[PDB]
Amino acid sequence: ADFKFEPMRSLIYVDCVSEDYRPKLQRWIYKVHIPDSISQFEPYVTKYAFYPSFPIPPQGDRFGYARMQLTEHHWLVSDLDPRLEIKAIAETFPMDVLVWQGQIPAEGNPFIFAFLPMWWEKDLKGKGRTIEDGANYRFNMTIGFPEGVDKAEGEKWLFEKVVPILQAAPECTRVLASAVKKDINGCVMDWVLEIWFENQSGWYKVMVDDMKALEKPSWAQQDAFPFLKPYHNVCSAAVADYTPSNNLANYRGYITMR
Amino acid sequence: ADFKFEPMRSLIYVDCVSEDYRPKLQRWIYKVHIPDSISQFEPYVTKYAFYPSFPIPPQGDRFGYARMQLTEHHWLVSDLDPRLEIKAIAETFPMDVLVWQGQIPAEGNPFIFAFLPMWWEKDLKGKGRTIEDGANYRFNMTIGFPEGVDKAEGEKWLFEKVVPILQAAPECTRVLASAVKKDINGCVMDWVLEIWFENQSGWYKVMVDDMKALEKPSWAQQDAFPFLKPYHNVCSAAVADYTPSNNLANYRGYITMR
Amino acid sequence: ADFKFEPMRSLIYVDCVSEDYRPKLQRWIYKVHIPDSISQFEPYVTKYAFYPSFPIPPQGDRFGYARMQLTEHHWLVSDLDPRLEIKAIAETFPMDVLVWQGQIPAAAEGNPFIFAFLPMWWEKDLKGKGRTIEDGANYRFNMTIGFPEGVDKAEGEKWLFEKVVPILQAAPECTRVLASAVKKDINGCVMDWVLEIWFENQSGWYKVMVDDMKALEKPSWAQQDAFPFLKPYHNVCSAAVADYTPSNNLANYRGYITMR
Amino acid sequence: ADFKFEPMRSLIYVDCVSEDYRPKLQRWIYKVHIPDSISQFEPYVTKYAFYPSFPIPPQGDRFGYARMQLTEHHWLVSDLDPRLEIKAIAETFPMDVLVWQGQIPAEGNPFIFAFLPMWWEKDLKGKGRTIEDGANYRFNMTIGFPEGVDKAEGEKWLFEKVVPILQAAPECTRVLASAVKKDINGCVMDWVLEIWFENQSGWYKVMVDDMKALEKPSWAQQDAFPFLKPYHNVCSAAVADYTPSNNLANYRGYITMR
Amino acid sequence: ADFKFEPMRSLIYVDCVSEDYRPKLQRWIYKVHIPDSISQFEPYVTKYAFYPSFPIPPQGDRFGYARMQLTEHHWLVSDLDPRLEIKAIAETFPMDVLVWQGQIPAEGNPFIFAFLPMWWEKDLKGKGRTIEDGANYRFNMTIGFPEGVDKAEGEKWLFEKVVPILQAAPECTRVLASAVKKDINGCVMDWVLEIWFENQSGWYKVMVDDMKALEKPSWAQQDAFPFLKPYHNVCSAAVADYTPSNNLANYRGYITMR
Amino acid sequence: ADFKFEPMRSLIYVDCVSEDYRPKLQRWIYKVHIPDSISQFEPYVTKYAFYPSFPIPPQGDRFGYARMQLTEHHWLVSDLDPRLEIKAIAETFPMDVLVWQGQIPAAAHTDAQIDSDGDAGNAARKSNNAEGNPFIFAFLPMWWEKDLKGKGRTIEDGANYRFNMTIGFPEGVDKAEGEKWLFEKVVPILQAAPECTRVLASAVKKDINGCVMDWVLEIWFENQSGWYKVMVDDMKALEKPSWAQQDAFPFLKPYHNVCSAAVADYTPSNNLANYRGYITMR
Ligand SMILES: [Cl-]
Ligand SMILES: [Cl-]
Ligand SMILES: [Cl-]
Ligand SMILES: [Cl-]
C-alpha cells in the first residue's frame, strides 16, 4: 500500500529535427500534451514547466542540442512506481511526435528523461549569485559515459579535468551538477550540469575554444569536447532564467491569435 | 511525532433528497463549505474538486445515486490522524445540511466517505482510451457487502461474475476498480468502481438489463443488481469527464449573477 | 473605421433534447466552444459565463425550458456589426450540436436558436428591490417571451405588466421580478421581453407559474391552453438557475482537465 | 438609449475611527463588500482595488486621514447614470459600517467619493520618475473649498501658493493633480493631488513645517494648512506603490488563517 | 474632458539584432516591461500579449524579420491622445534596449508601432478555417510604400498583383489584411497582412520562389519581393497559433528556474 | 539519500523599527523577496503567506510586537536540511533588510548583499547580533497541538483579533518548569476572561533550526481593548517569577524571548495563489 515520499526534479530534452515539424510539434505540446499531463499528475506533481530553448548556437549539434525545449517536472512520488502505470485517461500521442523529436525517422535518437533530486548536489562556481547580478545564458547539459567505461573514471575526468576549465573562464559565471538517479528509470545519463554564461559568445569561447585544450579520452565517441555521441550520450539546451510556460499555474487553454 | 506520507484520493457521495432542498444545499456548498475547507487543508491537499452528478437515470434510486455531486479530495496525509482534529476555525455547518443530504429526515442514510490509493488498482476494460475517443458517462459506484459476508466471497463474486458482464457489453467503454482503504475511517464500503458508457441508455442496458442474468446472492438486500441497500451499502454518481469546480485553482468567491 | 460603444448583456437558451446527448453536448461546450469563443472576443467582452439549468421542473417543458444552460455574454460592442463577421479562426462547429440542442431533428420539429440582447442593467424592478444575497438562496426563473405574428406589441406589453406581473407580485412565494425589453434592432431576435422571477424553490415556482396563473384568461392569440400561452422553445424559452456558477469563463477556465 | 463611454477613476476615503472597529470593518470589507461589488460591476469596471493606508502620521488627523484604506475604481460608464440604480442583488450593508468609518457619530463625517479622469491632468513635479528610482510615500489628498469660496480664487491659491513650496522642498519627489468631476455625484471635493515623499519624516517636514510659511486664508476652517475642516473638506491617505488587493484579478474567497 | 471609445489592436515588431543581446533583451521585456506596462494601462487595455518569433526563415533578413517578438495590444482608447502622456510611474527603459532591438547602432532601424482595427478588414483566402484544420505558420507582414509613391498605386499593386499569387498557391492557407490607422501615431506602414502556411518550406516556396514572377516595380528598394527596405519599409515575423505570454491573464512575476 | 517527509508550518516575526523604514522594507518584501522565494521553494512549499500586523497596541513593545508582519510558510521538507543550502539563484537580500527589521544597527555599506560562507538567506534568518534583535523563525507542526479554549468556533461567530505570540524561556531556566508555569498560571487567566474567545498552543520544533523560542500560542480577542484588558490588566495578577527579564507579563526580554503580532482572519497576500507581480499605482 505505502507509496514512498520521493521529491525529485526531472528533465526531458525535447528536440525538433526540422523547422517544418515545429508548428506541429509545438501545437501538440501546448494544445494536447499539457492538459493530458495535468489531468494525470496534478495531485502529486508540484511544478510542470517548459523552458523553450534559445536558438541552437554554432556547433550545438555536437552537444545534442534540444532545438524545441526542456520539459521539467517536480515529483512527490516516482512516476516509475508500477502502480502508476494505470491511468483512467491516457495521453493522446501519435507516432508522428517521435518523428518530429527524432526518436524515429520517416536508428533514431533515444528519449532522455533524467531524474535528479530537487537541489543540486554540487555547486562548483558562482555560489551566491543573485538575479540582480544580471541575465544568464543557462546551458543545461547531461552526459552519459559509453558502455564499459568505469563510472568513477568518468567522474574523475568530469570534475578534475572538465570543470576546472569552466572555473578558469571569467566568461563562465556558474557551475552546478547532480548525479543522475539511475535506479528510477535506467536513464543512460550519469550527470546533469548547468553552466552559465553572459551570452552565446561566452558559451562558445569556453565550450569549444577553451575545451580544445582537453585531451581526447580513449573512450571518445567524437573528436572534440564533449567526446560523447550527440543526442545519445549527451543532450543539452541553453535557456533563460524565466519561462512563461509554468504550466500548473498559468495554462488557460489553447487560445488562438486573432 | 512524525506524520506519515499517505497520499490518497477520497470520494464523498453527496445526495440531495428533494428539489426544494437544492438551492439551499448548493448555496451552502459553494458559498460556505469551499472556503472553510480550503482554509483548513490547503497546505496538505493538492486537489479539491466537485463533480456535479448528471440527472438521475431510471432505476438509479436503487444504486444510491448522489443527486447533488461527487466530492473529491487528494490528500498528502490522513485526514483521520487524531492530531488533525484540532483546527483554529471549524466549518460553519448548519444541521439542515444533514436533512438536505438525507442523513436525517427532519430512517436516514449514512455519510459515505471512501479513501483510496491515488491510482486505480485494477484496470479491466478500455486500457489505452484517451479523451480524443469521446465523451464518457462515467458511472462511479461504491459498494460494501453486508455484515456477515466473507469479503473474499464477495470479491470473488464481484470480479468473476459481475465484471465479465461489463467486459462482454460493447456499450461499456471502461472498467476500473480499487479496494477501499478500510483502515482509515471505517468506511463501510469495500470497493469503488468506475464503469463508463457513452450515454444514460447504455448504462441502463448494461447495468439493468444485462445484469438480470446474474443469479441473486444469498445475502441480497434487494431483488436486482446491485443487490445492496441503496445509500447504505451502495452509493453512486454518473459524472462528466470535466468539472469547472477544481477548487484549489478556480475559486474566486461567491459571485452572484446579475 | 468608427465603432459604437454598445455595452450589452446577451442570453442564449441552450437546450439538450435528450439525456443521451448530454455528455456530448456538454463536452463540446466546455472543451471546444469556450476556447474558440474566448479566442475570438477576449478583447471586447468583459464576462462570458454559463449558468447550468436546475433539473427541469414539472410542466417545465411548456416554458421552453433549456435543459443544459443559460449562456451569458457582456459585450462592449455589437457582435452583429458586419465588420465583426471576419475572424482569423472560425468556430469548430459540428452539425450534431444542432441535433443536441434541438435546432434540427435526428434521423419531431426543430426549435430555433434563441439569442437575445439586452441592456446590461435591468430596466424594470417590480418586486423585491433591495433584496441582498444575505436574504437566502434563490431559484431564479429566467424567462424570455415573444408574442406571435400579428399581435400588437403594446397590447402584449400591457398584458404582461397588467395581468401577469401582478400575479407574481401578489404571490408571497415570489421574492423578485425583473424585466427588460429585448434589443431587437441588434439581430432580429423574435423575443420581446426577458424576465427573471425568483422563488425559494421548485415547489414555489410551480404554485405561482402554474396554479396562480390558472386564473388568467386565455388570450385570443394563445398558442397553448395555459400560461405562458406561447409556443415552447419558439416564442418562450426559460431556465431556472442558481445565484452562482463556477463557469465564469474568462476568470476560471484552465483547459479541459479530465477526472482520474 | 445609449450608454455613454466614460472612462473615469474614482477614489473613496475610508476611515476607521477607532481601533476596536478595525477587525469588524476589515472583515466586512474583505468578506462581504468585495464579492457584492464584483458581482455588480465586473462587466464595466476594468479595475477595483484597495490601497491600505500607512499608519497615520503626526498631525494627520488634521488632513482627514483615512485610517482604513483608499478604494480605487476604474469605470467605463458613470455609476451615477440612473439606469444603474437597478440591481438584481443589493450591496449587503449593515448600519455599523457607517459607525466604523465615522459617517454616523459616536457629528458625522461625510462619505467622500471623488470621480476623476483616468489620467492625471497636471504633472507638477518629478515627471520622468520610474519605479527604479525607489519606494514612494504616496500622500493622496483631496480638498474642497468651503461654501462661498470662489472656485477659481481657490485654484489660484492652490497652484500659485501651495504647490511652489512642494516644488522647493527636495523632500517631495512628485506632485500630480486633477480636478474632481463634480458633475457625476456632486462630490464636494474640487481637487485630488498625490504628493510623494521618501518617508513619513519627509511628509512631515514639508506638509507641516514648510507649510507654516503660508498665510492663513480668510476662509480658513483651521489654523494650519490645509486650512480645511478634516474629513469634510479634506481627506487623505498615505499609501505604498503596490497593493496586494487588486481585487478583480486576485480575490479567491475569504480564506482564513489556520 | 471627453475620451473617444477607440477600440483597436496594435503591433510592434520587436527585433533582436544579435544572439548575444537576447538574454538581456528577453529579461528586460519579461522582468521590467511587463509590470511597468500593466501598471499603466490595465484599466483601458483588454489584452496585452507577446507572440515570440519562429526561427528566422531563409531570406527573412529581407522581410524585416523581427528576431524577438510581436508585441500585441488591444486598446479601448487611443494611446496617442496627449492626455495619456502624463503617467505617475514612467517606464524603466534604458537606451541599451534600443541597441538590442536595433533602433540605434554599433544605420538605425525605426521603431515600428502599427495601429489597426480589432477585426481584419479583408478576408482574401481561407475563410472558414478553424483550429481543427491543423497548425499554422503565421507570417505577419507590415509594409510601407516609400516616400513619393502614390498610396492608391501602392494598394493597387498589393491587391491586384501580389495577392493573386498568394491565392494561386495551395501552400498558402490564409490571407488577411487591414489598412494601418495612420492618423494615430504617424506610423510609416500602410498595410498589415497575415499570410499562413503549413511550415517554413511552404512559406519559402510562395514568398520567395512564386514571387520571382512579380515584376520589379519602379519604386523598388530591393531587387526582389517585397521590394521594400528591410526593417524601414517592411517588418515581419512568423508565429504560432498560441502564445503562453497572454500577459494580463498569465503573469505571476519573474520566477527564476532552479 | 532520502529526503524525509516533514510537514511543518513555520512563522517569522517581521518587525519594522521606524516608520521611515516602512516604505523601503515593504517594497523589498513585496517587489524582490516574493519572487526570489517562490522561485526557490515552489516545488515543496504548499503555502507562502504574509499576514500584516494590526497597529501596534498599547504596550506591544513589551511583547516583541512585529510592526510589519507575520510570514507563514508551510513545508513538505525541512528548509534546514544541509542539502537545501544549494540554490541556483540566491536571494537578493541586502543588509538594509536587517537594519530595517531591527536585527542589526544602522551603518554605511548596508545596501550590500549579506556575505555568508553558505547561503545568504539561511544565514540572514539566523541573525543574532548583540546590538540588534534576533531573527525569530519558529517551526511548528501543521496542526495546533493544544486547544485550550474556544473549540468549535466558526468564522460565522465574528471577526477575530488574533494575537500570535511566541516565547522562549531564558538561558538556564528549566524547560519543564516554564511549561508548567505557562499552562498552569498563564493560560488559566486567559480561560477566565470572557474577552478571550480562543487559546491555541504548539511547542516549537527546536530540533530544526535551533530557534530559542519554546512555545507558540495564539490567543483571540474581539479587539485591542480586550487584548489589553486581558494581556495587561488581568495579567497584573501574576506573580513575577525569579527568572523574569522585565517587571510585568510576559516577564520576557522583548524581541529576544518574546515576539508577537496581532493579525486578521484573512490576508490578501497568499503568495502562491495571488501574486501577479509588483503592479504599481497610477
Ligand atoms: Cl427489492
Ligand atoms: Cl395545449
Ligand atoms: Cl537587393
Ligand atoms: Cl521593565
Q: Distance between CA C199 and CA E110 in Å, rounded?
A: 64
Secondary structure (3-state) at F121 = helix
Taking phi first (over 0 means left), then psi (-120 to 50 degrees means alpha), and beta for anything else, what does residue C164 get? alpha
Cell 482520474 -> residue: C260
Q: Distance between CA B44 and CA B83 in Å, rounded?
A: 14
Name the residue in chain A with its Cα closest to that of F45.
Answer: A46
Find which of A8, A31, A242 to mutate to test the E interface (most E CBs within 10 Å of its CB): A242
Closest CA to F200 of F212, F214, F183: F183
Per-residue cell: A200: 552565446
Q: How many CA atoms lie within 13 A of E9 on its CB side?
A: 19
CB contact under 8 A, F83 and A194: no
How many cross-chain Cβ pairs, E to F, lie less than 8 Å apart?
A: 53
Q: How far is CA A237 from CA A17, B67, D111, E157, E239, in A?
A: 14, 52, 60, 45, 21
End-to-end alpha carbon distance in chain F: 52
Find which of E45, E48, E76, E86 to mutate to test the D interface (most D CBs within 10 Å of its CB): E86
Amino acid at A152: A
How many CB atoms are closer than 10 A to CB E47?
Answer: 18
Secondary structure (3-state) at F271 = helix
Per-residue cell: F235: 495579567
What is the DSSP annotation of D109-176? ----EEEEESS-SEEEE-TT-BGGG---EEEEEEE-PPTTS-HHHHHHHIIIIIHHHHHH-TTEEEEE
Q: Distance between CA E106 and CA E99 in Å, rounded?
A: 8
* Structural contact between residues D53 and D240, judged by C-beta atoms closer than 8 angstroms: no
Per-residue cell: A107: 536508428
Q: Residues D54-76, buried b or exposed e (16+ Cβ, 10 A)?
A: bebbeebebbbbbbbbbbbbbbb
Per the structure, how many domains does chain E have? 1
* Chain F neighbors of B93, CB-CB under 8 A: 154
Amino acid at C224: Q
Cβ-in-10-Å burial (0-12, 13-18, 19+) of E105 comes to exposed
Nearest to B131 among A5, A76, A92 (CB): A92
Instruction: Using the Cα atoms of residue C214, residue C220, residue C224 and residue C228 in order, give the sign of their dihedral.
Output: negative
CB contact under 8 A, F277 and E43: no
In this structure, the strands spanning F198-203 and C139-145 are unpaired
DSSP conformational letter for E223: S
Nearest to B90 among F46, F144, F153 (CB): F153
Q: What residues make up the domain containing B9?
A: 1-258
How many CB atoms are closer than 10 A to CB A13?
Answer: 28
Closest CA to A112 of A230, A226, A30: A230
Secondary structure (3-state) at F192 = helix
How many CB atoms are closer than 10 A to CB C95?
Answer: 8
Strand partners, E45: E75
Q: Distance between CA A180 and CA E73 in Å, rounded?
A: 44
Find which of C4, C6, C37, C83 to mutate to test the E interface (most E CBs within 10 Å of its CB): C83
Closest CA to E220 of E110, E121, E127, E143: E143
CB contact under 8 A, B255 and D42: yes
Q: Distance between CA B241 and CA B236 in Å, rounded?
A: 16
Q: Distance between CA C118 and CA F136 in Å, rounded?
A: 59
Cβ-in-10-Å burial (0-12, 13-18, 19+) of B128 comes to exposed
End-to-end alpha carbon distance in chain E: 51
* Structural contact between residues F42 and E253, judged by C-beta atoms closer than 8 angstroms: no
Amino acid at E243: T
Per-residue cell: D192: 485630488
Main-chain dihedrals φ then ψ at residue B130, nearest 5 degrees: -110, 175
Instruction: Using the Cα atoms of residue B187, residue B189, residue B194 and residue B199 in order, give the sign of their dihedral.
Output: negative
Quick one: CA torsion of D20, D21, D27, D29, rounded to 10 degrees?
-150
Q: How far is CA C171 from CA A149, B22, C139, C179, in A?
A: 89, 21, 15, 17
Q: How many residues does chain B have?
A: 258
How many cross-chain Cβ pairs, B to F, lie less than 8 Å apart?
A: 56
Q: Distance between CA D68 and CA D56 in Å, rounded?
A: 10
**CA triplet F118, F120, F122: central angle to 5 degrees?**
80
* Chain C neighbors of D4, CB-CB under 8 A: 5
Q: Distance between CA D115 and CA F103 in Å, rounded?
A: 44
Amino acid at A251: Y
Q: Which ligand approaches the C-alpha of residue F246 most closely?
A: 4
Main-chain dihedrals φ then ψ at residue D70, nearest 5 degrees: -95, 140
Q: Distance between CA B66 and CA F150 in Å, rounded?
A: 35
CB contact under 8 A, F282 and D118: yes
Q: Distance between CA B40 and CA C248 in Å, rounded?
A: 25
DSSP conformational letter for B52: E
Strand partners, E24: none
Q: Distance between CA D248 and CA F92 in Å, rounded?
A: 30
CB contact under 8 A, C44 and E7: yes
Sequence-ordered strand ranges (E) for chain A: 8-14, 45-52, 69-75, 113-116, 122-125, 137-143, 172-179, 191-197, 234-239
Nearest to C254 among B57, B200, B249 (CB): B249
Q: Which H or E element spans position A248?
A: helix A247-250
Interface residue ranges in chain B relative to chain D, Cβ cutoff 8 Å: 34-36, 38-40, 42-43, 87-89, 251-258
* Chain F neighbors of E38, CB-CB under 8 A: 277, 279
CB contact under 8 A, D23 and F278: no
Amino acid at D113: F
Q: How many residues does chain D have?
A: 258
CA of F254 to the centre of ligand 4 (A): 10
Q: Which H or E element spans position B247?
A: helix B247-250
DSSP conformational letter for A26: H
Find all residues with CB under 8 Å of D164, minimum gap 6, and list them: none
Amino acid at E118: M
Find all residues with CB under 8 Å of E64, minimum gap 6, and list them: E13, E15, E109, E112, E230, E231, E232, E233, E234, E235, E236
Per-residue cell: A112: 532522455
Nearest to A5 among F5, F36, F91 (CB): F5
Per-residue cell: B29: 456548498
Q: Distance between CA F222 and CA B125 in Å, rounded?
A: 59
Q: Which H or E element spans position E160?
A: none
DSSP conformational letter for D252: -
* Structural contact between residues F55 and D55, judged by C-beta atoms closer than 8 angstroms: yes
Q: Distance between CA E28 and CA E40 in Å, rounded?
A: 17
DSSP conformational letter for F77: S
Amino acid at A68: M
Secondary structure (3-state) at B136 = coil
Instruction: Using the Cα atoms of residue E116, residue E117, residue E122 and residue E123 in order, give the sign of their dihedral.
Output: positive
Taking phi first (over 0 means left), then psi (-120 to 50 degrees means alpha), and beta for anything else, what does residue F114 get? beta
Main-chain dihedrals φ then ψ at residue D200, nearest 5 degrees: -55, -50
Quick one: CA torsion of D163, D164, D168, D174, rounded to 10 degrees?
30
Closest CA to D231 of D218, D221, D239: D221
* Structural contact between residues A190 and A145, judged by C-beta atoms closer than 8 angstroms: yes
Cβ-in-10-Å burial (0-12, 13-18, 19+) of B85 comes to exposed
Name the residue in chain F with its Cα closest to that of E31.
Answer: F277
What is the DSSP annotation of F217-250? EEEEESSHHHHHIIIIIGGGGSPPPTT-SSSSTT
Chain center to CA of E57: 16
What is the DSSP annotation of F145-157? SEEEE-TT-BGGG
Q: Which ligand approaches the C-alpha of residue F254 most closely?
A: 4
Taking phi first (over 0 means left), then psi (-120 to 50 degrees means alpha), and beta for anything else, what does residue B24 get? alpha
Q: Distance between CA E207 and CA B101 in Å, rounded?
A: 66
Q: Distance between CA F39 and CA F59 in Å, rounded?
A: 38
Secondary structure (3-state) at C157 = helix
Instruction: Using the Cα atoms of residue D96, residue D100, residue D105 and residue D108 in order, give the sign of their dihedral.
Output: negative
How many CB atoms are closer than 10 A to CB C58?
Answer: 12
* Chain B neighbors of A43, CB-CB under 8 A: 7, 9, 46-47, 74, 118
Q: Residues D85-101, buried b or exposed e (16+ Cβ, 10 A)?
A: eebbbbebeeeebebbb
Per-residue cell: D251: 480575490
Amino acid at B112: I
Please compute Rg for chain A using Cα positions.
Answer: 19
Strand order in the sheet with E137-143: E122-125, E172-179, E191-197, E137-143, E234-239
**Residues lying with their CB under 5 A of ligand 3, a single-atom ion:** E 222-223
Closest CA to D200 of F21, C219, F48, C227: F21
Main-chain dihedrals φ then ψ at residue D187, nearest 5 degrees: -60, 140
Q: How many residues does chain C have?
A: 260
Q: Distance between CA F197 and CA F149 in Å, rounded?
A: 7
CB contact under 8 A, D258 and B35: no
Nearest to A132 among F44, F87, F92 (CB): F92
Find all residues with CB under 8 Å of F18, minimum gap 6, and list them: none
Give F70→chain D minimum CA distance, Å: 11
**Helices marked H in F182-223:** 187-192, 206-209
Give D240→chain F minimum CA distance, Å: 7
* Structural contact between residues F177 and F242, judged by C-beta atoms closer than 8 angstroms: no
* Chain E neighbors of C77, CB-CB under 8 A: 7
Q: Distance between CA C54 and CA C52 in Å, rounded?
A: 7
Quick one: CA torsion of A171, A176, A177, A181, rounded to 10 degrees?
-140
Q: Distance between CA C217 and CA C211 in Å, rounded?
A: 13
Q: Residues B209-222, buried b or exposed e (16+ Cβ, 10 A)?
A: ebbeeeeebebeee
Q: Distance between CA D208 and CA D195 in Å, rounded?
A: 13
Secondary structure (3-state) at D4 = coil
* Chain E neighbors of D194, CB-CB under 8 A: 88
Name the residue in chain C with its Cα closest to that of D90.
Answer: C132
Find which of E87, E91, E95 to mutate to test the D interface (most D CBs within 10 Å of its CB): E87
Method by which the model was determined: X-ray
Q: Distance between CA E162 and CA E228 in Å, rounded?
A: 13
Quick one: CA torsion of C13, C14, C19, C22, rounded to 10 degrees?
-150
* Structural contact between residues F122 and F46, judged by C-beta atoms closer than 8 angstroms: no
Interface residue ranges in chain C relative to chain E, Cβ cutoff 8 Å: 1, 3-5, 36, 39, 42-44, 46, 76-77, 83-84, 86-93
* Chain F neighbors of B95, CB-CB under 8 A: none
CB contact under 8 A, D34 and B253: yes
Find all residues with CB under 8 Å of D218, minimum gap 6, and list them: none
B29-33's contacts with Cβ under 8 Å and 24+ in sequence apart are B29/B68, B29/B69, B30/B245, B30/B254, B30/C244, B30/C246, B31/B254, B31/C244, B32/B92, B33/B91
Q: Distance between CA E4 and CA E183 in Å, rounded?
A: 14
Q: How many CA atoms lie within 13 A of D215 on its CB side?
A: 6
CB contact under 8 A, E118 and C44: yes
Quick one: CA torsion of E168, E172, E178, E180, rounded to 10 degrees?
-100
Amino acid at B76: L
Q: Distance between CA C119 and CA C194 in Å, rounded?
A: 11
In this structure, the strands spanning C139-145 and C115-118 are unpaired
Q: Residues A117-149, buried b or exposed e (16+ Cβ, 10 A)?
A: bbbbeebbbbbbbbbeeebbbbbbbbbbbbeeb
Q: Distance between CA C93 and CA E128 in Å, rounded?
A: 11
Interface residue ranges in chain E relative to chain C, Cβ cutoff 8 Å: 5-7, 9, 46-47, 74, 76, 117-121, 123, 127-132, 174, 176, 181, 194, 241
Per-residue cell: F52: 500584516
Q: How many CA atoms lie within 13 A of A116 on its CB side?
A: 26
Give B168→chain C minimum CA distance, Å: 21
Peptide bond into E57 cis (omega under 30): no
Find all residues with CB under 8 Å of C54, minimum gap 6, and list them: B19, B22, B23, C139, C202, C239, C240, C241, C242
Give A218→chain F minimum CA distance, Å: 33
Q: Which ligand approaches the C-alpha of residue B227 most closely?
A: 1
Per-residue cell: B35: 472556503
Chain center to CA of E195: 12
CB contact under 8 A, E23 and A239: no
* Structural contact between residues D181 and D79, judged by C-beta atoms closer than 8 angstroms: no
Per-residue cell: F165: 505570540
* Chain E neighbors of C87, CB-CB under 8 A: 119-120
Q: How many residues does chain F have?
A: 282
How many cross-chain Cβ pairs, B to D, lie less than 8 Å apart?
A: 53
Closest CA to B223 of B56, B110, B59, B15: B59
Q: Distance between CA A125 and CA A117 in Å, rounded?
A: 19
Amino acid at E218: S
* Structural contact between residues E195 and E26, judged by C-beta atoms closer than 8 angstroms: no
* Structural contact between residues D165 and D211, judged by C-beta atoms closer than 8 angstroms: yes
With residues binned 3-state (H G I as helix, E B as strand, rest as coil), the percentages for chain D, rounded to 5, are 30, 25, 45
Secondary structure (3-state) at E133 = helix
Main-chain dihedrals φ then ψ at residue D142, nearest 5 degrees: -115, 140
Closest CA to E181 of E89, E78, E36, E49: E78
* Structural contact between residues B157 and A62, judged by C-beta atoms closer than 8 angstroms: no
End-to-end alpha carbon distance in chain A: 50
Main-chain dihedrals φ then ψ at residue A142, nearest 5 degrees: -125, 140
